[PDB]
CSV table of C-alpha atoms in Angstrom, one decimal:
chain,number,residue,atom,x,y,z
A,1,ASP,CA,-57.0,14.2,-36.9
A,2,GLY,CA,-58.1,10.6,-36.3
A,3,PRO,CA,-57.6,7.4,-34.2
A,4,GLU,CA,-54.2,6.4,-35.4
A,5,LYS,CA,-52.7,9.5,-33.8
A,6,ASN,CA,-54.1,8.6,-30.4
A,7,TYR,CA,-53.4,4.9,-30.6
A,8,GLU,CA,-49.7,5.3,-31.7
A,9,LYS,CA,-49.0,8.2,-29.4
A,10,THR,CA,-50.3,6.0,-26.5
A,11,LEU,CA,-47.9,3.3,-27.7
A,12,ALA,CA,-45.0,5.7,-27.6
A,13,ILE,CA,-45.9,6.9,-24.1
A,14,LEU,CA,-46.2,3.3,-22.9
A,15,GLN,CA,-42.8,2.3,-24.2
A,16,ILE,CA,-41.3,5.5,-22.6
A,17,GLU,CA,-42.8,4.8,-19.2
A,18,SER,CA,-42.1,1.1,-19.3
A,19,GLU,CA,-38.4,1.8,-20.1
A,20,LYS,CA,-38.4,4.3,-17.2
A,21,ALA,CA,-39.7,1.6,-14.8
A,22,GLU,CA,-37.1,-0.8,-16.0
A,23,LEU,CA,-34.3,1.7,-15.4
A,24,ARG,CA,-35.5,2.8,-12.0
A,25,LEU,CA,-35.5,-0.8,-10.7
A,26,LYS,CA,-32.2,-1.4,-12.4
A,27,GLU,CA,-30.8,1.6,-10.6
A,28,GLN,CA,-32.0,0.3,-7.3
A,29,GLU,CA,-30.3,-3.1,-7.7
A,30,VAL,CA,-27.2,-1.3,-9.0
A,31,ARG,CA,-26.9,0.9,-6.0
A,32,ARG,CA,-27.5,-2.1,-3.8
A,33,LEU,CA,-24.7,-4.0,-5.2
A,34,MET,CA,-22.3,-1.1,-5.4
A,35,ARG,CA,-22.9,-0.3,-1.7
A,36,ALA,CA,-22.7,-3.9,-0.5
A,37,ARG,CA,-19.4,-4.2,-2.3
A,38,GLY,CA,-17.3,-1.4,-3.6
A,39,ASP,CA,-16.7,-2.8,-7.0
A,40,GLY,CA,-18.1,0.3,-8.7
A,41,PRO,CA,-17.6,4.1,-9.1
A,42,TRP,CA,-20.2,4.9,-6.4
A,43,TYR,CA,-19.9,4.5,-2.7
A,44,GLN,CA,-16.1,4.4,-2.9
A,45,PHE,CA,-15.4,5.8,0.5
A,46,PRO,CA,-12.1,7.7,1.0
A,47,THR,CA,-8.8,6.1,2.1
A,48,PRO,CA,-5.6,7.7,3.4
A,49,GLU,CA,-3.5,9.5,0.9
A,50,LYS,CA,-0.5,7.6,-0.5
A,51,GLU,CA,1.6,10.5,-1.9
A,52,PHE,CA,2.3,12.0,1.6
A,53,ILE,CA,4.3,9.0,2.7
A,54,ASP,CA,8.0,9.5,3.0
A,55,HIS,CA,10.1,6.8,1.3
A,56,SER,CA,13.5,8.5,1.8
A,57,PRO,CA,16.3,7.0,3.8
A,58,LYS,CA,15.5,7.4,7.5
A,59,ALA,CA,17.7,7.7,10.6
A,60,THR,CA,17.3,4.0,11.5
A,61,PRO,CA,17.1,1.2,9.0
A,62,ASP,CA,14.2,-0.7,10.5
A,63,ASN,CA,11.8,2.2,9.9
B,1,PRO,CA,1.7,-18.3,12.9
B,2,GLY,CA,5.1,-18.4,11.3
B,3,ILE,CA,8.1,-19.1,13.5
B,4,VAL,CA,10.9,-16.4,13.7
B,5,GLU,CA,14.3,-17.6,12.6
B,6,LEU,CA,17.3,-16.4,14.6
B,7,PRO,CA,21.0,-17.1,14.5
B,8,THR,CA,22.7,-19.3,17.1
B,9,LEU,CA,25.1,-18.0,19.8
B,10,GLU,CA,28.0,-19.1,17.7
B,11,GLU,CA,26.7,-17.2,14.7
B,12,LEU,CA,27.3,-14.2,16.9
B,13,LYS,CA,30.5,-15.2,18.8
B,14,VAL,CA,32.9,-12.5,17.7
B,15,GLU,CA,36.2,-11.0,18.7
B,16,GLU,CA,35.0,-7.7,20.2
B,17,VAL,CA,36.8,-4.4,20.4
B,18,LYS,CA,36.5,-4.1,24.2
B,19,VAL,CA,37.5,-0.4,23.8
B,20,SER,CA,36.0,2.7,25.4
B,21,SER,CA,34.4,5.8,24.0
B,22,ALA,CA,37.0,8.5,24.3
B,23,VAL,CA,39.7,6.2,22.9
B,24,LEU,CA,37.3,5.8,20.1
B,25,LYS,CA,36.2,9.4,19.6
B,26,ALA,CA,39.9,10.3,19.3
B,27,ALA,CA,40.4,7.9,16.4
B,28,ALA,CA,37.0,8.5,14.8
B,29,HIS,CA,38.3,10.7,12.1
B,30,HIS,CA,40.9,8.2,11.0
B,31,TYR,CA,38.5,5.2,11.3
B,32,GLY,CA,36.2,7.1,9.0
B,33,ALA,CA,38.8,7.2,6.2
B,34,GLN,CA,40.5,3.9,6.7
B,35,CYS,CA,37.9,1.1,7.2
B,36,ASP,CA,35.3,3.1,5.2
B,37,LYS,CA,34.7,0.6,2.5
B,38,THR,CA,33.6,-2.2,4.8
B,39,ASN,CA,31.6,0.2,7.0
B,40,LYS,CA,29.7,1.6,4.0
B,41,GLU,CA,29.0,-1.9,2.6
B,42,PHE,CA,27.6,-2.9,6.0
B,43,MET,CA,25.5,0.3,6.1
B,44,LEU,CA,24.2,-0.3,2.5
B,45,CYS,CA,23.2,-3.8,3.4
B,46,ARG,CA,21.6,-2.9,6.8
B,47,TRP,CA,19.4,-0.2,5.1
B,48,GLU,CA,18.8,-1.9,1.8
B,49,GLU,CA,18.0,-5.2,3.6
B,50,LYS,CA,16.0,-4.2,6.6
B,51,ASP,CA,17.0,-7.4,8.5
B,52,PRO,CA,20.0,-7.8,10.9
B,53,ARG,CA,19.8,-11.5,10.3
B,54,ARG,CA,20.8,-11.0,6.6
B,55,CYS,CA,24.0,-9.0,7.6
B,56,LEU,CA,26.1,-10.6,10.3
B,57,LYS,CA,29.2,-11.2,8.3
């Protein structure tokens, strides 16, 4: 075919793998921040359920 | 950290019933019909407001 094919295919492969590197490191820092502080969707550890509390009138006022 | 507020002795000085429990069980059914308005207001305050200090009167 020629040299242009190899050259430009190499360029494509290079941008692909560079972007992958970028995203892997980004994922590392993202997981770090999400775990150190639960601001994000991940590492949101469970809490007690709210809907199983009874809010009705009790037997004593100062419940 | 925050001090508790409490009423004074004279904010509780009251003419008490000084009446026993059988004398009172006997007249329960009439004290539930007469003197129901005040009693139910006191109940509503005591359960709506969860503080005794907000309902002495």
